[PDB]
Structures are given as C-alpha cells and as structure tokens.
Short mmCIF file of N, CA and C and ligand atoms in Angstrom, two decimals:
data_model
loop_
_atom_site.label_atom_id
_atom_site.label_comp_id
_atom_site.label_asym_id
_atom_site.label_seq_id
_atom_site.Cartn_x
_atom_site.Cartn_y
_atom_site.Cartn_z
N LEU W 2 -28.90 45.97 -14.41
CA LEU W 2 -28.35 45.51 -13.17
C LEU W 2 -29.12 44.34 -12.59
N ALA W 3 -30.45 44.46 -12.52
CA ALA W 3 -31.27 43.45 -11.87
C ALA W 3 -30.93 42.04 -12.39
N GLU W 4 -30.96 41.91 -13.70
CA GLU W 4 -30.78 40.59 -14.30
C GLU W 4 -29.32 40.15 -14.38
N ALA W 5 -28.38 41.10 -14.48
CA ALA W 5 -26.98 40.77 -14.30
C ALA W 5 -26.79 39.99 -12.97
N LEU W 6 -27.38 40.54 -11.91
CA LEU W 6 -27.24 39.95 -10.58
C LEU W 6 -28.00 38.65 -10.49
N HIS W 7 -29.24 38.63 -10.98
CA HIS W 7 -29.98 37.39 -10.82
C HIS W 7 -29.34 36.26 -11.60
N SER W 8 -28.72 36.55 -12.73
CA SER W 8 -27.99 35.53 -13.48
C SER W 8 -26.77 35.02 -12.71
N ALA W 9 -26.00 35.95 -12.15
CA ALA W 9 -24.84 35.62 -11.35
C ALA W 9 -25.16 34.67 -10.19
N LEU W 10 -26.36 34.87 -9.65
CA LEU W 10 -26.77 34.18 -8.44
C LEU W 10 -27.28 32.78 -8.73
CO1 LIG R 1 -34.32 38.25 -12.48
#
C-alpha cells in the first residue's frame, strides 16, 4: 500500500 500511494502521488 505505502508505495502504491507514493507512486500515485
Ligand atoms: Co514511498
């Protein structure tokens, strides 16, 4: 989850 979101951002 953490990196899914940071990539999206
Ligand atoms: Co990150």
